[PDB]
Design a protein around this nucleic acid. Structure first.
Length: 849
DNA sequence: TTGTGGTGT
């Protein structure tokens, strides 16, 4: 055992802490206690009955509305706005099947519609089912929900389908996503939403009584939400005979879904696209004759393929495919030559180059921008080059989407972001390096890593169509055809890679009490070791009790749109009056940092972060400071200048602000706050006290802790509580810093790439860890009296302080248990406020003099 | 000294 610094407190302070605890301990309407007890008392049978009663609205129809819409449809079909738009809609493949689709839905509860881009299924299939019900004079009985993986999809598809109907948004077509909606009318309507919205609405309506038609789209992409929803439909659909489901998929393991729902009807709908010629590494080295130079394994794969094709390609081509570095992005200069080649031959069109990461995007960018070769210098001023990465500004500006200046060919160097989330319409030529990066989590060693990997067959299939949007394109694949056959079908479904805390807890509100029983029924069942490890985390933060049942705290957390650890942090912040800074830190960890990282500006950006951090040694507080500065710039009408100087995304910042206000209102709705403004003065009386902030930030991120032993920019010896060596990720404001007031840090995310990195961190103090943590005991190890936390970090503490801190932790526990069962804001002068003021005092001892 | 991508009445 190694002993750390002294946490003992002066007599005057311990005297006051004790006086305050005694005030608190002298204390003597909850609908929520009734709601919580009622959830736990019903079995599943009673749960299904009761929800049927509260969501009855769709048992009611409006014949005057049925008729009036039946009438306005037939009437407006003779006008000239429609009948051209009906006629151009009849050009889409999906419409050929309308009557066969209507019949399949009528005769079956679940059916599957399989089709690729341009078949129109997403825009057309809702309109078909809706205009049918209108025409038969049912319009008021028809309410259609169509889920989408991505926010942008949901809006744009909803604006489009609305235009096709000669209506503004908000009438028969609407969209709802997180914190934004243009809702359609209540009946006879189509609603596009993100898959997550539909899941949250299950809490109020777990059997989907408020919809007549559910349409899941892009289920082949295997997002966590659509996998969950399909599992949950196996539970729901037996109790909902009148409910109609349409599954929708690309042709990517489409049988998996047809299998999963009995053997249900499957429509295949032919695509609309310009053909994109597929070439491989043999075909590229055949055209450009590029020459390489500056395990095997690889020899075992390629040689058998070379034999079958030996008379279809030159012997020097086949000899190049034997080089390990011929495949992928290992040689950037090779890719550079391919871009130059397409500039020389081939018609005008944009090149989209798929490389795995930020590192490789910079390399090709520098080679294309500052060319060393003569051919590159020829082409340099004739290319308009956009790097495209989730961290770079180009995605959020207008340039990369528009066609380039005349005489310039647009070359986009992108990550997998250009596969779906971001689409550029003028791309005619796709260079697919075949390499992407992946996050893997090893459950055994508890290390998440970020590794370069080969893409899957589905990735390549998708990237090919990115060349076929405008005219016939070409897709250049920088791997052999032999590699393709070794590639997996689809990427590992997201749920097999994901932390299960949030899902497990969420199921409890749906009266799915056994996560092992339920999660096993998905298309791909998660490792039960991941389920257990999720249950254990929820038990650790006391969202589930020892027998695994929901606690009152856990029902609250289950009701916040954030992971349960950060939901708990936000609650603490209400009780401890730091609401504005803590919700900023919470919102940024859930979504993302506002900082761009443009090419070449890295150190300029490390400077801006360090500046905004205001020497507080916290990535999380640093973001809040940024949001404070952002707000002040709008009050100053300086906003746009402010975002340019500091390399900040205004789209991200406004989104953080929306998330924060959402957490404000929910907590105010739950009676933890007196005001739904996250800037409200009562809620923020502590928001200036930085040790209190670090304590609450730590309360959320515990138990992720690190200890720093070294010196030198500076060099760091640091290890997590598990013993493993780590460093601050170079993008964290703590990288290379020295002169920390404390040797302890908490972090949200640890990731292995070229080292074991803490992606984000806050400097914390031992007294805060002890109060809000667990594994606390007092003792004597050598001849020193100690106080520990997590049975890991042992601190010198005299006995008077240990006996107070431990009495303090008991009262804090008793308090939280009360506040969760009987929600009500902490009264400013009451008994509860005394215990808060006791903790404020003890934590304030670590203030910087 | 370095960062695949989604998302939550």
């Amino acid at each position: 055992i190694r002993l750390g610094c002294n946490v003992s407190a002066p007599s005057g302070v311990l005297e006051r802490v004790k006086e305050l605890m005694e005030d608190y301990s002298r204390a003597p309407d909850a609908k929520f206690q009734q709601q919580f007890r009622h959830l736990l008392s019903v079995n599943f049978e009673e749960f299904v009955a009761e929800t049927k009663e509260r969501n009855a609205d769709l048992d009611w129809v409006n014949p005057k509305l049925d008729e009036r819409l039946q009438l306005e449809l037939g009437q407006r079909q003779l006008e000239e706005n429609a009948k051209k738009r009906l006629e151009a809609r009849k050009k889409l493949p999906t419409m050929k099947y309308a009557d066969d689709i209507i019949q399949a839905v009528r005769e079956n509860q679940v059916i599957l519609i399989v089709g690729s881009t341009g078949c129109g299924k997403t825009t057309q299939v809702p309109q078909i089912l809706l205009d049918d019900a209108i025409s038969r004079g049912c319009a008021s009985s028809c309410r259609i929900i169509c889920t989408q993986p991505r926010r942008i999809s949901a809006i744009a598809i909803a604006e489009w389908v609305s235009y096709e109907r000669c209506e503004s948004l908000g009438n028969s077509v609407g969209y709802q996503i997180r914190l934004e909606s243009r809702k359609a009318r209540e009946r006879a309507s189509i609603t596009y939403c993100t898959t997550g919205v539909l899941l949250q609405q299950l809490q109020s309506d777990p059997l989907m009584h408020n919809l007549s038609v559910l349409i899941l789209d892009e289920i082949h992409e295997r997002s966590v939400e659509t996998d969950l929803l399909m599992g949950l439909l196996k539970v729901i659909l037996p109790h909902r005979p009148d409910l109609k489901v349409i599954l929708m998929s690309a042709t990517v393991r489409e049988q998996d879904f047809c299998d999963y729902f009995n053997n249900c009807p499957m429509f295949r709908i032919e695509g609309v696209m310009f053909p994109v010629k597929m070439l491989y590494l043999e075909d590229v080295l055949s055209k450009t004759n590029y020459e390489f130079q500056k395990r095997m394994k690889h020899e075992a794969m390629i040689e058998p393929y070379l034999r079958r094709i030996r008379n279809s390609y030159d012997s020097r081509v086949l000899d190049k495919l034997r080089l390990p570095e011929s495949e992928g992005c290992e040689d950037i200069d090779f890719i550079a030559d391919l871009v130059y080649y397409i500039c020389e031959n081939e018609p005008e069109g944009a090149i989209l180059v798929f490389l795995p990461g930020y590192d490789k995007i910079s390399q090709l960018y520098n080679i294309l921008d500052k060319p060393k070769t003569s051919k590159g210098q020829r082409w340099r001023d004739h290319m308009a080059v956009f790097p495209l990465h989730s961290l770079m500004q180009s995605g959020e500006q207008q340039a990369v989407f528009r066609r380039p200046p005349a005489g310039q060919r647009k070359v986009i160097i992108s990550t997998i972001i250009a596969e779906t989330s971001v689409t550029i319409d003028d791309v005619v030529y796709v260079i697919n390096s075949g390499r992407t990066k992946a996050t893997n989590y090893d459950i055994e060693t508890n290390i998440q890593s970020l590794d370069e990997v080969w893409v899957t067959k589905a990735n390549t299939q998708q990237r090919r169509g990115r060349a076929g949007r405008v005219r016939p394109g070409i897709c250049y694949n920088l791997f052999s055809r032999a590699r393709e056959d070794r590639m997996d079908d689809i990427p590992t479904p997201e749920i097999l890679r994901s932390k299960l805390e949030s899902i497990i807890l969420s199921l409890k509100l749906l009266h799915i009490d056994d996560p092992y029983r339920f999660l096993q029924t998905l298309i791909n069942a998660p490792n039960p070791e991941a389920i257990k490890m999720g249950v254990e985390l929820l038990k650790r933060i006391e969202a589930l009790d020892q027998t695994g049942t929901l606690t009152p705290l856990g029902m609250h957390l289950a009701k916040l749109p954030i992971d349960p650890q950060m939901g708990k942090m936000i609650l603490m912040s209400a009780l401890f009056c730091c609401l504005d800074p803590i919700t900023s830190a919470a919102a940024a960890l859930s979504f993302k940092s506002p900082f761009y990282s443009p090419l070449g500006k890295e150190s300029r950006v490390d400077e801006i972060k360090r500046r905004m951090a205001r020497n507080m040694r916290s990535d999380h507080l640093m973001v809040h400071n940024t949001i404070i500065a952002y707000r002040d710039s709008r009050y100053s009408h300086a906003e746009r200048d402010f975002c340019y100087k500091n390399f900040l995304s205004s789209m991200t910042l406004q989104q953080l602000e929306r998330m924060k206000n959402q957490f404000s209102e929910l907590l105010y709705n739950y009676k933890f706050l007196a005001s739904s403004n996250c800037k409200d003065a009562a809620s923020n009386k502590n928001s200036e006290k930085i040790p209190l902030l670090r304590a609450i930030i730590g309360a959320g991120l515990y138990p992720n802790m690190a200890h720093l032993r070294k010196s030198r920019r500076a060099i760091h010896t640091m290890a997590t509580d598990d013993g493993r060596r780590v460093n601050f990720h170079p993008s964290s404001v703590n990288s290379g810093e020295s002169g920390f007031d404390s040797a302890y840090f908490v972090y949200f995310q640890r990731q292995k790439s070229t080292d074991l990195f803490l992606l984000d961190s806050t400097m914390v103090f031992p007294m805060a860890l002890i109060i809000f943590g667990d594994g606390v005991e007092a003792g004597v190890t050598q001849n020193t009296p100690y106080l520990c936390v997590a049975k890991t970090y042992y601190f010198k503490c005299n006995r008077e302080t240990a006996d107070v801190v431990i009495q303090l932790r008991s009262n804090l526990e008793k308090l939280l248990l009360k506040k969760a069962l009987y929600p009500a804001p902490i009264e400013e002068n009451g008994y509860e406020k005394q215990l808060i003021k006791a903790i404020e005092l003890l934590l304030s001892l670590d203030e910087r003099l």
